[PDB]
Design an enzyme around this catalytic site. Sequence first.
Site, PDB file in Angstrom:
ATOM      1  N   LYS A 236      49.496  68.905  27.915  1.00 36.92           N
ATOM      2  CA  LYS A 236      49.612  68.668  29.350  1.00 36.92           C
ATOM      3  C   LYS A 236      48.593  69.487  30.132  1.00 36.92           C
ATOM      4  O   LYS A 236      47.876  68.953  30.989  1.00 36.92           O
ATOM      5  CB  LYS A 236      51.038  68.991  29.803  1.00 36.92           C
ATOM      6  CG  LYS A 236      51.267  68.877  31.300  1.00 36.92           C
ATOM      7  CD  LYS A 236      52.698  69.259  31.753  1.00 36.92           C
ATOM      8  CE  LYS A 236      53.320  70.440  30.997  1.00 36.92           C
ATOM      9  NZ  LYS A 236      53.083  71.740  31.692  1.00 36.92           N
TER      10      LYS A 236
ATOM     11  N   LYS B 222      55.137  79.198  30.353  1.00 42.55           N
ATOM     12  CA  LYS B 222      54.965  79.164  28.876  1.00 42.55           C
ATOM     13  C   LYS B 222      53.608  78.543  28.519  1.00 42.55           C
ATOM     14  O   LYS B 222      53.324  78.413  27.314  1.00 42.55           O
ATOM     15  CB  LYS B 222      56.115  78.368  28.249  1.00 42.55           C
ATOM     16  CG  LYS B 222      56.119  78.301  26.729  1.00 42.55           C
ATOM     17  CD  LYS B 222      57.276  77.503  26.164  1.00 42.55           C
ATOM     18  CE  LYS B 222      57.195  76.021  26.465  1.00 42.55           C
ATOM     19  NZ  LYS B 222      56.027  75.390  25.805  1.00 42.55           N
TER      20      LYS B 222
ATOM     21  N   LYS C  55      56.568  68.000  28.516  1.00 40.22           N
ATOM     22  CA  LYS C  55      56.930  68.886  27.423  1.00 40.22           C
ATOM     23  C   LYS C  55      55.745  69.770  27.053  1.00 40.22           C
ATOM     24  O   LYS C  55      54.585  69.442  27.313  1.00 40.22           O
ATOM     25  CB  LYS C  55      57.371  68.067  26.208  1.00 40.22           C
ATOM     26  CG  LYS C  55      58.193  68.823  25.182  1.00 40.22           C
ATOM     27  CD  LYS C  55      58.256  68.051  23.866  1.00 40.22           C
ATOM     28  CE  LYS C  55      58.282  68.986  22.663  1.00 40.22           C
ATOM     29  NZ  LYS C  55      56.910  69.377  22.210  1.00 40.22           N
TER      30      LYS C  55
ATOM     31  N   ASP D 245      59.925  71.103  29.836  1.00 42.37           N
ATOM     32  CA  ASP D 245      60.678  71.205  28.557  1.00 42.37           C
ATOM     33  C   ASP D 245      62.165  70.977  28.848  1.00 42.37           C
ATOM     34  O   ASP D 245      62.733  70.021  28.291  1.00 42.37           O
ATOM     35  CB  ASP D 245      60.418  72.541  27.858  1.00 42.37           C
ATOM     36  CG  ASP D 245      59.341  72.454  26.791  1.00 42.37           C
ATOM     37  OD1 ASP D 245      59.418  71.535  25.955  1.00 42.37           O
ATOM     38  OD2 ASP D 245      58.432  73.304  26.806  1.00 42.37           O
TER      39      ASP D 245
END
Lengths: 277, 280
Positions: B22, B49, B17, B136
Amino acid sequence: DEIAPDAKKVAIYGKGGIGKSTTTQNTAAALAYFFDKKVMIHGCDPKADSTRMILHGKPQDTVMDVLREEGEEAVTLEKVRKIGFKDILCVESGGPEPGVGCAGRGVITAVDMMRELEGYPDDLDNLFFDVLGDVVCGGFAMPLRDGLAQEIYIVTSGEMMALYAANNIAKGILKYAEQSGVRLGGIICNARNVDGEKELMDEFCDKLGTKLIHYVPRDNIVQKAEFNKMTVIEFDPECNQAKEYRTLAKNIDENDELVKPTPMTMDELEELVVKYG
Amino acid sequence: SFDEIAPDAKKVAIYGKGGIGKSTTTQNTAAALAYFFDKKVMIHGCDPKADSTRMILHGKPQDTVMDVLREEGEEAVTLEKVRKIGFKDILCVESGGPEPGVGCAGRGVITAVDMMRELEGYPDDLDNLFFDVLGDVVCGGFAMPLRDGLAQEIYIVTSGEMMALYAANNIAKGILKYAEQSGVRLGGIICNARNVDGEKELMDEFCDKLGTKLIHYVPRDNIVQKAEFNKMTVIEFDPECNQAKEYRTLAKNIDENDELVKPTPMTMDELEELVVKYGL
Ligand code: SF4
């Protein structure tokens, strides 16, 4: 084009985790409560979180989940369309099955299923599509490619990623302005409470050739109402935040300035975020 | 076939996510490998993203493969333009995002990798290759790396939040779906602790039920943000602090890990039971 004939069709686009769905539901409730409008929300976020505050806690079954588990003949309006606060109709498209399938295919199928079930009433005053804009891929930007709604509004905040996401959505709008008649009606700021955030937005809107339809302030009564699985409108229609959503809802309903945006380049955007610190 | 890429290296995909650190963990793990073990390391960003290489290139934004491909053409994409060198000679490349309304973000990562392969941008002497992938939403696009066998060894970053564990379970579902077809396996869970709390026990059980293991518990430490503020990894900022050793341990464990499994994703009830037992 043939869905909800005399209804203002609007899509609320924006990055995730910035309160987009809270603003969409409170705006919908503001219309039904303050201005007696028949409103319908069709959620298009994979999280399926666009109607929980209208239906009060219960997460509604998504169209794509029902269709996966049952099939075309079995799906019914009673199962996928729920009525909530002020008789607002609620539908959720749902996300893809992990590992396969595109988000956009799910929303097309859900809209199609709603079409075949005659689920968008003819007397609807306002239909809202709550759509995720973290990435403007073929799936999440399908509403822009096909003009699912011609009147787009972008939610953003005084944060780098949220402005980035907003700008990239404006690119999708500009790209399909002629093909699908899509337009940008304005920008909604869910405030992060950053110094000079209102000025940051005014400028950002000017560069994009659009406007700030409303500056939605940060207010604790929001988290209060949602802890009760409620919109601020239903929790306390008299509080100041309720009037803030009322102004937002009224500005959208009255808006006629639908423009082709002029997205900024990455360099101008770097300047803007560097200048507001 | 993608088994061509970096044949002598441990090829690894890191799913997770957003908003959980991350990319921070991937870059610090890469920095530890190169700094402490003189590894030849490379990072290929697959998160449109998330910036996956900013900490290695000292804050210098990197031209993405897909941007150069779309706005300049196939000829323009050159190793010089898309492959950059940062801290301790860690090679860096960014796949980029999709063409608005048409491009598939996940297919573009495959296009990015394919282009990189045609430009011989994956050195044969690589010791470690990292694909930092968005987890995600597990749509078919971002499950392509799993079905295409970009890396047979997958790692999932999560934290103590419901949505992080929820997303981690869904990624485990994506691995299992193509585990037979592509040989893709789950090597372990990485926990980016949200706080100094009892998260480890929650993670130990989570991994147990998924049929995997906790490859490391990355503690919460403000030195991460201080290093990020200087556009560095913790390794470059202060290689002697405890958090640097935490990444060192994680890097070592990933490098030598040979315990790969087909995960057993949790049911929705199981996820609720875990949430109840450990608090909302
Ligand atoms: S177009 Fe987007 S939502 Fe669809 S499969 Fe590709 S990355 Fe996923």
